[PDB]
Amino acid sequence: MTAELQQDDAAGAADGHGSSCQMLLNQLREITGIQDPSFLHEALKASNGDITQAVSLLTDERVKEPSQDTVATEPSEVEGSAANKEVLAKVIDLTHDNKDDLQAAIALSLLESPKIQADG
Using what technique was this structure determined?
NMR
Backbone phi and psi for residue 46, each to the nearest 5 degrees, phi listed first: -85, -30
Domains and CATH numbers, the chain: 20-65 (1.10.8.10)
**Integer-rounded Cα radius of gyration of the chain:** 27
d(CA 36, CA 107): 45
CA atoms within 13 A on the CB side of 109: 8
Using DSSP's 3-state secondary structure scheme, residue 50 falls into coil
b/e 7-39 (16+ beta carbons within 10 angstroms → b): eeeeeeeeeeeeeeeeebbebbeebbebeeeee
d(CA 88, CA 66): 26
